[PDB]
Every structure is written in C-alpha cells, then in structure tokens.
Amino acid sequence: RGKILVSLMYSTQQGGLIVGIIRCVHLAAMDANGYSDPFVKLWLKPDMGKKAKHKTQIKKKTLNPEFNEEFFYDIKHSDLAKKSLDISVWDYDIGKSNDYIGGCQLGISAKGERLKHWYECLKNKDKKIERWHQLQNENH
Numbered sequence: 001r002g003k004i005l006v007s008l009m010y011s012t013q014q015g016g017l018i019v020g021i022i023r024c025v026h027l028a029a030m031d032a033n034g035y036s037d038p039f040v041k042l043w044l045k046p047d048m049g050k051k052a053k054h055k056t057q058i059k060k061k062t063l064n065p066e067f068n069e070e071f072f073y074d075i076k077h078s079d080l081a082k083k084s085l086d087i088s089v090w091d092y093d094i095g096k097s098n099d100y101i102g103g104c105q106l107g108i109s110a111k112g113e114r115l116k117h118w119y120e121c122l123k124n125k126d127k128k129i130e131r132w133h134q135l136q137n138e139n140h
Contacts, residue, residue: 001102001137002027002063004040004089007070007130008106008121010077017044017073017080017121021056021087022130027063030091030099035061037092038101044073044085045107058092080122081108089135102135 007020021040030036037060043053052073059065075083084107091099106118114133121129 001135002038002089003132003134004087004103005130005132006087006106006117007128008085008118009128010080010121010125011072012077012125014072015074015076017075017083017085019054019071019073019085019087020128020130021067021069021071023064023066023068024059024089024135025064025132027065027089027135028091028101029063030093030101031061033061036063036099036101037061037094038063038065038089039092039098040067040069040087040089041103042071042085042087044075044083046084048074055090060092060094077122077125081119083107084109085118087133088138100137100140102137104133104136106133
C-alpha cells in the first residue's frame, strides 16, 4: 500500500489545526506500467460540516511522490484531541474515476501510536509534528 508523511501543527492564535501532507512512499500501482496517481484526502470528524474533507495535488504516474501541502482545520484546541483526522490516499485517473490506495485515522481517541503523533500535536501546537503513517485499507 505504501506510507504517507503527515505533518501536524495547531495554530491556537487562529484557533484551528494544521495538516501538512508532505509526501508518500511505496505506493501501489493502478496502471499496467507499475505505477499510480495517488493523492491524499483529509477529513476531521465528527466535523462541523460536509466540507471537512480534502484532497492534495494528484501525484500522477508515481508511487513515491511528494505533496508538501499545508492544510488548515477549523477546530477548537479543546476539541482537537477528541477530533479524528482521516488521512486517506487514493489513486487518480484522467478521463476515468479515482481509486482507493490506503489511509489511516488520527484521533486522540486512538491508542498505540496514532495517539502519540496526533495528540502530541495538541501539545506541540506552534510546533510542527510530522511522521510517516502506514496506509491501510478501509472500504475498497
């Protein structure tokens, strides 16, 4: 499936969270060429609206591209923790439909590892918290 580098960071000043989609590696190939067009979509829940979802630039013809996209969430730090960032990577296709490659969930409600990276973000607001996440298959 591959892994995607996610850089977190909360801006208390602005009163919101910051999601940074750096890059991905070891991504699957959707084309017969042995490559793919993976992109990353982010959605924090429970959310406040139906626009909490996102999608980084399309990394066409590549399994180990670099997004380097900095997002901005509108959630109160006090709620951040309880939040749950869903970073999913999907394959893109011109003239056709997309595809599910893999993703992961990031919410303080988690336990094991994601809580360490996510939660810490709440502690290291102004500080950038980045790390590599292992892509998983939820609903293919």
